[model samples]
Target: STGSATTTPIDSLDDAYITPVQIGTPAQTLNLDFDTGSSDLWVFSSETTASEVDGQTIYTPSKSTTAKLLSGATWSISYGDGSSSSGDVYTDTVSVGGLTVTGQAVESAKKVSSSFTEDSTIDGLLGLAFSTLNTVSPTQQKTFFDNAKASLDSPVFTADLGYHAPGTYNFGFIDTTAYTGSITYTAVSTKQGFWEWTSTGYAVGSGTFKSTSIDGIADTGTTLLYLPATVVSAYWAQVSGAKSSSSVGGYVFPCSATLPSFTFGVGSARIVIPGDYIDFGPISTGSSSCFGGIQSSAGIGINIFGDVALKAAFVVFNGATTPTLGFASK
Candidate 1:
């Protein structure tokens, strides 16, 4: 039993996105993203007619040795950022980093926006985050993670990324060498994939944010840390007397002083956000620099610790292990 358990590794996308898989006698490839926030692998296709999408990578079914259309499977997704797209479904063979699985799932969107079309680097999105909030659901689409779990080299996946621009995604297994020390594990709630947590405390630079304690969830799909308004204002107050400048959008600290090092307490984990990450380089805004961390998105209930905070540590989703998730450093 232990040998059989050790035999199946959890198939993983590069960075929360699906790669491809092989099936049947001879293997084939499929490119996908594993988005928990949504459940679907959307690829841009030549059938897409959206004019605004000029330079995106469109998948050609002809490129695959074994690709088949799902007859009537079609979908459209709209994000909070006001971006949207539509596509058809297909089952094909896909390959990623040499691992091959067969009869894998895939989608081809017909209409897309500039955000997906302009980027030549990535091919498509393979959402593996969760199935509850999937745009492809109501239609009853199972996530790639759900399908791949049975055939993986191990029932585990890990992501190792550096910086925000170009990050690497690996599958089959977690690179234990990427992190230091033992990981702190937390049980995942069956409802969603978001990393929910209760903050033990909060501190900006070296000072605390009033006498209040804080708590929230961490997300990889989100780019910014959405903190509460009152806490946000209180945080900036401790810095070099900074004010939110309208140029770069969020709280923009002045360019004159050394940026503050803010820290948040996660369980026993004291996560720190350094100064360099705070100053998001220079912008057209002449006076203030774009503050790297912390933003005030009004009406947002939970304080989201997005990729900015999670990147500081190595994270693992061990649904197979216990009810817990795991975190460490890379």
Candidate 2:
């Protein structure tokens, strides 16, 4: 049978969709952010130091009868001050929603950064992308999507994340009823270690589609749409009172200005991002100028089709033999 999971967003930015995950026997559950860009299933655990913790529920492996340590396997990174935030590894039965996978690598935190604890509701992170990026040494382990694919009805997963609402992550099979129109599929550059793909062209408002190359990754963890400077400038040019400010970091325009929608092409299909999605929100809670969700990726070095653009369509991460990415209107 196909597997399905539900997730929620609470950042107010409406993109940190946290999925509830279960680890070990008798069930230790936590709300985890499934980052499709990073591949390391880490958690706040019994081994985590109390100083590095907030309100997250730490996993107590000693209480789990089925947990087995994968000795010598560790995920580590040295800090600038000479200290290190690292952790040990274990294998346990894991589940998301109702889907289960056994012998899943579970990285338990020992020492970690305060940023990891700031989010009171987020307990850990589950990697949803290619396992090649996983941080485990000596040996690597498969992701939930990776380990469950063979047993799945099909080797594909679909993400249906929309704005201000709960979306779902589906594995094994695609639900035709979840989307509208036909899915426009494109080949992915798997060597890049991400579900990266190319876009053929773009259109601002109802302007003519300027054919060009737009490359980026489908990163669920990213909150906004980042494109080339040229594309970004063209978008802002259409709005009055729009200006790029250093303090604001990106393009901002008066909240009273009318905004135009943005669109990009994928194998001839145009996915439209409504103007409301681009007018991110106010520069400050009470500010009259609003920041745009669509920003220039020039400084970041890589483009990202984040939840802002994703909210406009249904995306499929096809993990079949010939991997491909698909998008359809919702």
Candidate 3:
């Protein structure tokens, strides 16, 4: 869930841990996947061999004047996808956005796998989630947000997926210039992790599905809006003359007409997701196209509102004050 490569002990072989570490400077600018499922900031290192990716940002402790290793302990992580990498534990001056904290805990994967090595677009992952679930335990498991919170002007971090381009997920303190609209604050539920939220149900054009209430999780690790099958099938039934069709990988429909807009209410604040986002590309099914509104999760959990949903609005993760999620226009 936290996109870990492998879990290895710091010094004692008896303990096992996995989590990313924060590195680099705000001036240099490192790309990272802002994840909420785990609390560790890790980046690919220059010493990586197996997962050696060209043009990716790799941390070099030797280059940093202020760098320290943690008890000479070497570690590695293997994700559930079977990809793995090896590295060492170190502490250095790391920066996020514009805030820099000296002697921040970090993990430098020495032997990174080719799965992420070839993709130069991503440098590392930033863990903005809860600290209790962090995998880098038994030694150094401190998260970037936990350390940087003291230096950040606002003890908060917000993500604006305004651009769908390659480097769209650049991290730092949010520039609120884009959020010129009213700020809608939501009370964060006392859930485990993964930034969980409550959804008031689905809506179409002018009709609202007040009968259903789905629990949702806002995740940047995922790619699409994973919804329940019941909601997906019902949504297709409402579209004008829309028929269930099969596609390359999943089920979709071929509709040339303009689709309607819908909103998901969170307590008193409601967020709108345009209908055009429902028109997904090809799927595995046959010629039938699939609707992107609801995706089948094979009974994994409730809905996972990913980047597609965040792109519609500016999301702020308040870690300093009341520990709430703020939404506004960008």
Candidate 4:
């Protein structure tokens, strides 16, 4: 029952990756964001009011012969950026790539925040976080990966995120051709409902690596890399024209400024983010100022190795007894 899926970037936003998924007996195809940071398979649905839904596609359970309403069950979720959704529940067949999970719990959104409704490209979110974090009431629901794990040869998945290009999310098996060099393994702490791990150290540019044990979560849904305020300030200090701007809500520097590369250490393995990647494009259209991709994770409570960092390497999420992460050059 092993399978895999190819994920493509949404336009040139580079904000999130979306993959095609089929739901229900007749298999209604929807483009979903495969998020590793949260656990819940939620989608815009027929239950949503027309005015509340903008340009997004909505799933109609009534059209599927296998859709079953989970009486009295409901789900609501809010993300770090204040985006949110709430919905009812249904049990239906959900498939990714060629792997199928029968009677998988699917949350259908009846209400969504402006942030979510405005993002028309993303029709749903398929959570890859631990099942314990599922938001269903009465009884918690299992994720697509959790339901499919038992049938898989190995309870593992790999995320090969690209830089404004197509990547892939491989399940049950690892594709050796997707990465290069030896895969460095690291243990993860799922107590916080994330693929959380600690970095042995980090460095700015060609400077020495500081042995700072920074704990962070690997979040594919988040677009920017967020570290501690001190760490962010340290990196910005090295850039001559960089400044924290209230208007931009993050550190910004002249687009012409020569940026330095950032590096994070996972045990003996070092992952380097190039200078160009650190400059996350111009802050606004036609502006000469650009926002730094790395920022302070002040209110967020935990550092996030978001897309800005994750896109720099190939990541393996091992769901074995001792959950681990394997990193290698892409």
For lDDT, the strongest prediction is 4
lDDT of 1 by residue, 184-276 (tens): 765555455454555566677777544455556656555556777887787788666577766656776666768776676645666666655
Candidate 1 local distance difference test against the native: 0.57
TM-score quality measure for candidate 3 = 0.75
Q: How close to the true structure is residue 90 of candidate 4, measured as C-alpha lDDT?
A: 96
How many pairs of residues collide in model 1?
Answer: 46
True-vs-predicted CA distance for residue 164, candidate 4, Å? 1.1
How well is each residue in 1-330 modelled by candidate 3, as lDDT tens digits?
011121121111111122233454323345555665556666777666643768776777777667777666655556433566556677777654335667666777666777667656566656667766555535646677777677666677666553322212223355557576776777665367567776667665678645467777776555556667776666666666565444433345564546666666665566677776555543433534444544554456557776556766778777755577777755
Q: Between 1 and 4, whose TM-score is larger? A: 4
Candidate 4 residues 225-245, lDDT tens each?
A: 999999899999999889999
Top TM-score model: 4
Tens-digit per-residue lDDT, 297-327, candidate 2 = 8867789988888878899999988889999
The C-alpha lDDT values of all candidates are 0.57, 0.85, 0.58, 0.90
**Which of candidates 2 and 3 is the stronger one according to lDDT?**
2
TM for every model, in the order presented, reads 0.78, 0.93, 0.75, 0.97
**For model 4, what is the error of residue 284's alpha carbon versus the real structure, in angstroms, after optimal superposition?**
2.0
lDDT of 4: 0.90
Candidate 2 regions exceeding 4 Å error are 77-85
Q: Which parts of model 3 have CA positions greater than 4 angstroms off? A: 1-29, 51-55, 72-86, 110-115, 163-176, 209-211, 238-250, 255-260, 283-294
Model 4 TM-score, 2 decimals: 0.97
